[PDB]
Amino acid sequence: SMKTDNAMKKIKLAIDGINQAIDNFNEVQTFTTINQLNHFKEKLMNCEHLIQLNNIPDKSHRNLGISRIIIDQWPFDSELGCMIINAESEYKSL
């Protein structure tokens, strides 16, 4: 659907940004780790898979917990944190 298409686009944007951070880790090492970035990527990748399987959880079980960690731990100006929050929030809005 149009709604799931917008979610897919935002999720791929977020994964691409994480990939860019893993490849340029010097840029982000003061606030995240490769282990955390891969944790986030795994969860976003699982969101893609559940959408592709038409097996999305109900609206009450869409919390990845990623947004809360970024809000609490990452710099507010982080363009990467924005991208990820946009993806988790679009998933939640489905």
Q: Give the tokens for residue 49.
A: 């898979």
Place of tokens 């282990």: 35
**String of DSSP letters for 81-92:** HHHHHHHHHHHH
78 C-beta neighbours (distance < 10 Å), count: 18
- Residue bearing tokens 């606030």: 31
Yes or no: say if 14 and 45 are a contact pair by the CB < 8 Å rule: no
> Which experimental method was this entry solved with?
X-ray
Which residues 6+ apart lie within 8 Å of 89 measured at CB?
Answer: 67
